[PDB]
């Protein structure tokens, strides 16, 4: 086995997703971004983007443009919880239906590539006793 | 857990094998394992060579069963 050492190094590290750091990630077009994520995401964008996902992105873009003192970009509500989070919509706040209520989530960078409804549980957890 | 059968053949066991196997009515994989304390894989290579060396006569040939007897 010889030996082993683990001296971890840094350089003012910016958050990075699969070799692409946050700076370049956000202004990459979503066409380019999907080429470096999982198989399920890659298949979905090849199948054709219907109007519903693209319409939410347009509203989400406008909601950030409404405010330019750099605070939270006001909530956009939606039912479409099969939305795949893209770097374009990082930092936006969306209200995602869980069947009854608008769960409010703020799009953190580590949420990218996930399904929008995966962060809003649709059922209150069971509590016996 | 108590088996701890020997899998490496040293020199003390090697000549003990060639001194004990001929004095057997019937040798097989289990017979070699049972009394010589060697492993099953080591028994199989020992049988295939002891037959090639002429000490052991093959009564019956089979993958799952090797029936051998003394050649004297």
């Amino acid at each position: 086995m010889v030996d082993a050492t683990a001296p971890k190094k840094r350089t003012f590290k910016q958050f990075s997703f699969k070799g692409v750091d946050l700076k370049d990630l956000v202004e990459m077009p979503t066409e380019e971004f999907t080429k470096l994520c999982g198989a399920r995401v890659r298949r979905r964008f090849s199948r054709g983007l219907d109007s519903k996902p693209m319409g939410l992105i347009k509203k989400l873009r406008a909601a950030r443009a409404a405010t330019e003192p750099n605070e939270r970009p006001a909530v956009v509500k939606t039912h479409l919880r099969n939305m795949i989070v893209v770097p374009e919509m990082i930092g936006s706040v969306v209200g995602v239906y869980n069947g009854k209520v608008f769960n409010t989530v703020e799009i953190k960078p580590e949420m990218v590539g996930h399904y929008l409804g995966e962060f809003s549980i649709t059922y209150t957890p069971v509590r016996h006793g | 857990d108590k088996a701890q059968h020997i899998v490496i053949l040293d020199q003390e066991k090697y000549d003990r094998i060639l001194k004990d196997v001929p004095t057997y009515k019937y040798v097989s994989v289990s017979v070699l394992v049972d009394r010589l304390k060697i492993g099953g894989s080591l028994a199989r290579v020992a049988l295939r060579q002891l037959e090639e060396d002429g000490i052991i006569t093959p009564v019956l040939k089979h993958s799952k069963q090797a029936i051998y007897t003394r050649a004297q």
Partner: protein
């Protein structure tokens, strides 16, 4: 192709990647004791290192032992396919990796908080210790 004998060369206990390996196990199945090394993976690193599988663990010399730990730590450098690896398309740097004994639980852990930090549904059920892959829990998994 015949029985051979040796004295003093066998090594009863091996230490690879800070894990103790029993020396009387066949080499392909001895390495499976190292967590992160399965039967399929151990078969290929031995074939890439030109270590014939017909050898017990203690039979190997030091020269061969170092040659194996080098390959496991650099699989892509030894014509090991990317799809054959443990951790491919890594989350942070996007390169294909194969995590090993002590590194596996660290990055397995780092994946758990990464799921829990974003508070995804899969990460939440992992926190509760419940099944995360959609399994029914009504009637199964009642032990403790």
């Amino acid at each position: 192709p015949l029985v051979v004998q040796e004295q003093g060369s066998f090594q009863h206990i091996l230490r690879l990647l800070n894990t103790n390996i029993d020396g009387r196990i066949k080499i392909m199945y001895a390495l499976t004791k190292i967590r992160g090394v399965g039967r399929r993976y151990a078969n290929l690193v031995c074939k890439k290192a030109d270590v014939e599988l017909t050898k017990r663990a203690g039979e190997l010399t030091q020269e061969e032992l170092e040659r194996i730990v080098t390959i496991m730590q650099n699989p892509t450098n030894y014509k090991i396919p990317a799809w054959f690896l443990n951790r491919q398309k890594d989350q942070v740097d996007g390169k294909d990796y194969h995590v090993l004994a002590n590194n596996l639980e660290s990055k397995l852990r780092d994946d758990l908080e990464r799921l829990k930090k974003i508070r995804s549904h899969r990460g939440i059920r992992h926190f509760w210790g419940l099944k995360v892959r959609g399994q029914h829990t009504k009637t199964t998994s009642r032990g403790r």
